[PDB]
């Protein structure tokens, strides 16, 4: 896949209620509150069950257990793609590269980390 420009430090992110915040300052509650505020999107916990790094040049394959039922979902992303872990924030495969490329402090995504994902409601 590819990488969008909104993970870049200083990127203005508009929360559900209209409030503006820099992407580096986003917290778990900002997402939780935004899902509540929204009339169509809700938050779904996605737990990382396995990370199969170096699938191909610059890509990792992550296997999640999405939502209540825990449906096995595997996805393919550029190593520097950051997920937002509940109570932890931006987390990727290569924190170092995500930080260098995005100037975003970042954790090491790990088996067991519950990520924030979305589904219609």
């Amino acid at each position: 896949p590819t990488l969008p420009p909104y993970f870049m430090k200083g990127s203005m992110i508009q929360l559900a209620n209209g409030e503006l915040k820099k992407v580096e300052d986003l917290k778990t509650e900002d997402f939780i509150q935004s899902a509540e505020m929204s009339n169509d999107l809700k938050i779904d916990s996605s737990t990382v069950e396995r990370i199969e790094d170096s699938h191909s040049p610059g890509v990792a394959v992550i296997q999640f257990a999405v939502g209540e039922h825990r449906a096995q979902v595997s996805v393919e992303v550029l190593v520097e793609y950051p997920f937002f872990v509940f109570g932890q924030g931006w987390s990727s495969c290569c924190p170092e590269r995500t930080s260098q490329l995005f100037d975003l402090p970042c954790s090491k995504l790990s088996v067991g980390d519950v990520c924030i994902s979305l589904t219609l409601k």
């Binding site: 909104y6 203005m12 992110i13 508009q14 997402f31």
Partner: peptide
């Protein structure tokens, strides 16, 4: 005045 802004729902995947 106006500025380019990204919505919060772009930062999180639809797994």
């Amino acid at each position: 005045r106006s500025v380019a802004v990204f919505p919060w729902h772009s930062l999180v995947p639809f797994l």
